[PDB]
Amino acid sequence: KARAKAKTRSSRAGLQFPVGRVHRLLRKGNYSERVGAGAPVYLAAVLEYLTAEILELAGNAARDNKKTRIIPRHLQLAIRNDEELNKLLGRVTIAQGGVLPNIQAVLLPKKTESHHK
């Protein structure tokens, strides 16, 4: 016996997310009788990619307000300004998120407010 040292599957997948934790959460929760080996890697990679996308947008919005730390407002701005995420999270409320500044053009004053004598 040699007992090769304890490399982990996440490192093998080139991922940061924990494969084993997802496997555990699938076993416990009664989604199905059996679970296949390849599923949780795929699943973890999916979650990582989405998380990266969100944080990317949030960081851009953060730089717009000259703040170095991400706060919820930035996340709300990130979600609502990207079409696909808005579809995915169409019925979700972000706490302390607020809304976009969109005001309809009609209720804004007349742009023909100029030199008038």
Binding site: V92, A95, Q96, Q104
Partner: protein, 86 residues
Amino acid sequence: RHRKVLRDNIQGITKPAIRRLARRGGVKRISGLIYEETRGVLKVFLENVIRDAVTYTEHAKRKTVTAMDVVYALKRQGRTLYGFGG
């Protein structure tokens, strides 16, 4: 004295607060009749939510309503909420 502050009830949810909320919704000019109707609407929403929360509360034999029960109750009505646990 009969003070009963504006009713000792919902009518403490004053007009300018509703105005502020309408300002968040992009609204510019509001009629006087909106206020009462809004209150009614609010009441209805709250009722349903609280009922579900309390039902969850009754299942676990507790007398303190927790955040998690409210979140799940909000989830079943298609109004999922993030930022208060689960």
